[PDB]
Design a protein around this ligand. Structure first.
Ligand SMILES: CN1CCN(C(=O)c2cc(I)c(-n3cccc3)c(I)c2O)CC1
Ligand SMILES: [Zn+2]
Length: 196
């Protein structure tokens, strides 16, 4: 009743990568390697790189799912709060309850698991554009970490899985996420707290 978060490169050497966006007050998405934590504003583009050592088979897919980080909340489905699930912000593909969306990919599919009720969004693997060495998926997080009746200040993890055409596991990586108004300030604060 809890998805695994164990990092697993698998046969294709799968792992994530993040840009270096800095901590200026204006930054909208910034990743802390020291915390393995992405800080982002509500509904803003979060570029996540996908890296492999070798090409996975045709029909391989990449799925994203959120879980609560704290063990005492891990069995609770992460969903949008009672306010945001009712706001008129649909993109025509993502169900209004889903926290994580993929931006700019008409082949994205959204799953409400019939057994666990967890939400996820999955896209087909596509090779990098000519001249690039990795593929980037653009995610959006559709609720603040602080939203009452939803995440309610509880930290979450995003689990990214590489899957075969039947959904079997080929690779896994993960990162913590805080969705907040000032990601640059919050990253600096939490990195300072860690250094102390
Ligand atoms: C050194 N080799 C050069 C040739 N490779 C690719 O073109 C490649 C193919 C795929 I499909 C993907 N891909 C994985 C998940 C989503 C897209 C990626 I990231 C790639 O780098 C593999 C690595
Ligand atoms: Zn919300």
């Amino acid at each position: 009743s809890v998805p695994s978060q164990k990092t697993y490169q698998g046969s294709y050497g799968f792992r994530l990568g993040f840009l270096h966006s800095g901590t200026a007050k204006s930054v909208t998405c910034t990743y802390s390697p020291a915390l393995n934590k992405l800080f982002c504003q509500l509904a803003k583009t979060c570029p996540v790189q996908l890296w492999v050592d070798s090409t996975p088979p045709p029909g391989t897919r990449v799925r994203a799912m959120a879980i609560y980080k704290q063990s005492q909340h891990m069995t609770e489905v992460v969903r949008r709060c009672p306010h945001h699930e009712r706001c008129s912000d649909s993109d025509g593909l993502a169900p209004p309850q889903h926290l994580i969306r993929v931006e700019g990919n008409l082949r994205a599919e959204y799953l409400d698991d019939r057994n666990t009720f967890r939400h996820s969004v999955v896209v087909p693997c596509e090779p990098p554009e000519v001249g690039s060495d990795c593929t980037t998926i653009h995610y959006n997080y559709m609720c603040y970490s602080s939203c009452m009746g939803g995440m309610n200040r509880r930290p979450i993890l995003t689990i990214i899985t590489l899957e075969d055409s039947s959904g079997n596991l080929l690779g896994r990586d993960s990162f913590e996420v805080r969705v907040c108004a000032c990601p640059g300030r919050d990253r600096r604060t939490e990195e300072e707290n860690l250094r102390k």
